[model samples]
Target: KVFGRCELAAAMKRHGLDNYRGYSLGNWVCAAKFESNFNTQATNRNTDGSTDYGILQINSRWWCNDGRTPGSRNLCNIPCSALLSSDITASVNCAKKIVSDGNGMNAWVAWRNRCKGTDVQAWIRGCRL
Candidate 1:
């Protein structure tokens, strides 16, 4: 149950993700699947035409901003290991932050409902996939 080298590679390939970080990918994909069915063209509500997109659910307005050097999560380069030295985890955490936005768990629990929330276990005896 080490699931380190090949297991990670295989899981990444199977899930159609370009990047791989076991728990992080699980969190992202779980949310993506439940939220958008893993569609990159996914979007949420907006008054004008702007909306959220991608697995990270980045906002279009922010994503397309020309002034914000970093832009949005969709356009911005991966965060600088904000997720504890794991960019992929950071991406998922970033998405979780977006949806949750301090709401205390509506968005996060959605993914947890599907993936069972075990995906975030940094270390555990039976957490290895």
Candidate 2:
């Protein structure tokens, strides 16, 4: 339900996601902007029959269970619905866990394809930390 990028970025910052594992806050902003448009409830069905969830668009096959996808790894240990909530703690914590395993932000395809190597200033532009 976050209405704007600055609001999203501020919330992310308060949740200690401003800078993590050497990745800039701008990187997160950019990835979320493209992956879910800052909408926590966003979901997308992949061609492979997998679903992406939440602002990070975490994959159901590896990260969370969407009921339709049986036997998900549930690596995050939180239900897929948790990721879709406005309270992003579970989502951000799970994302942190994922990155700590050495995957980094590269674990997100959206980051690789859209945020990485791009000027991310606009993602946080006009947002005063």
Candidate 3:
């Protein structure tokens, strides 16, 4: 499935992303095309060693920072999974807070600039406060 109710829906709903359905659909596709080619289960290490997992490109290693140790129970506890789990709302809400949070959008925008094609600032549009 391209999207799952628990993850995509909850993530979208939490970020108040309902309004951008069509646009977000394109954005998601773009993210997939650029980031990990729509690999939901894909995992990668950023230059800084931060780990991004899942389709939404969630950074589990960072979000679940408290649990980043071998055999540490939290280590396997994916933060994004929490949103897909019981408290789905929290997933998007967490994303919203992080994106809207100062420096969050700016950083993403800066990184997005590296993407090919016309300046991709819109990749993270509206994410900034």
Candidate 4:
């Protein structure tokens, strides 16, 4: 299911994405706005043939196993399908791992240009309180 802005923020909040790995809920909320437009079913194929799956768009190459990504480490130990679910728990968990690799929120290039560590509290204003 597609989620509205506050709905996504609230759900990610429940998952403790706020300040997760030093990134704010605003960063998470903003990342979702650009990454998948809040669609839980989103997927994108990379030029290297890896697929980005689900709400946070975790990659098949290193995060989820898609069964065809040549050198998948399956760092999240989850099948790519889990990321597609509307629940988003798997997505958030995988993303929590995604950030630990040292990139933090910059793991998603989409977040770089926009989120940019602004700490823009209003991104999740009403949902956060």
Candidate 5:
């Protein structure tokens, strides 16, 4: 895992993501927790043969390529494996792009299914920052 919940919140705040497109830092933290449990190495293969990568579970169908995935769009211009690394600058940048593209956090099913409309403050409750 790249960060514990508190550290992740602090990092996200340092990245100036406390409020991106009106989503609160708590929402972002909540989404990340549900998506990958803050695990940078997390990956999940979809039934459609696409994959989700990194803490936010960015989809290979649109964001990155796994090499074996023949039809990947690679819109984030990165190797899918890059998202699995501890350095998440690229992943965060790509996520910003995705949010700017109009989906907001709706691009992540985890956010929609789990974090949306829930009490998100707890995600950052113990963070000192």
Candidate 6:
């Protein structure tokens, strides 16, 4: 599912991402925009032989089991294919788990480069979360 800006914001909040670990709802909104543009089926293969899956682009080498990421830990204990589902429930749970692993929202490279310290207020401008 490709969500609109406010739609994604509201969804993430309902899924427990709103200040899940000190990061605001806008931070998630902005990160999703840069990561997968709110598209649940997005995927990106990295040069390191790892693949990123889902809306937040969680990595196979660490989070999901792709059966091909070489040393996948599968810390999120889910199939990478699950991340692509438009339901987004499992994906969001894994996203929180990633944040719980201690890197905060920096778990996503796009979030680090595009959301961190940026004026994310615009991302959820009128989203009445």
The numbered model that scores best in TM-score is 6
* Candidate 1 structure quality by residue, lDDT tens digits, 1-129: 123333443344454442332234445445555655544444574565555544445554443332333334443444322322212343444553454454433444446576654553322223334
Each prediction's whole-model lDDT (CA): 0.42, 0.85, 0.44, 0.88, 0.87, 0.88
C-alpha-based local distance difference test score of model 5: 0.87
Q: CA lDDT of 105 in candidate 4? A: 80
lDDT of 4: 0.88
In candidate 5, where is summed lDDT lowest over 10 consecutive residues? 84-93
Report how far residue 105 has shifted in candidate 3, in Å: 3.8
lDDT by residue (tens digit), candidate 3, 16-121: 6543422343343344444444445555656655665544455654454424523323333445445333333443454454445455433333235544344443
- Compute the lDDT for candidate 1: 0.42
Kindly list the per-residue Cα lDDT of model 4 for residues 1-129, writing each as its tens digit: 899999988899889998887787888888888899999999999999999998878899898899999999999999999999989999998888888888788889889988785766778877734
Q: Can you give the TM-score per candidate against the true fold?
A: 0.36, 0.91, 0.47, 0.94, 0.94, 0.94
C-alpha lDDT (0 to 100) for residue 51 of candidate 3? 61
* Pairs of colliding residues, candidate 4: none
Q: Is candidate 2 or candidate 3 better by lDDT?
A: 2
Encode model 5's per-residue lDDT on 1-129: one tens digit a residue. Answer: 568888989888888778888888999898888889899999999998888999889998888988877788899999999888887787788888898898788988889999889998888886799
Off by over 4 Å in 5: none
Superposed by TM-score, candidate 2 places the C-alpha of residue 26 at a distance from the truth, in angstroms, of 0.3
lDDT of 6 by residue, 1-129 (tens): 888888778888888888888888888888888999889999999999999998889999999999998889999999999999978888889988988887788788888887788798888886677
Which of candidates 4 and 6 reaches a greater TM-score? 6
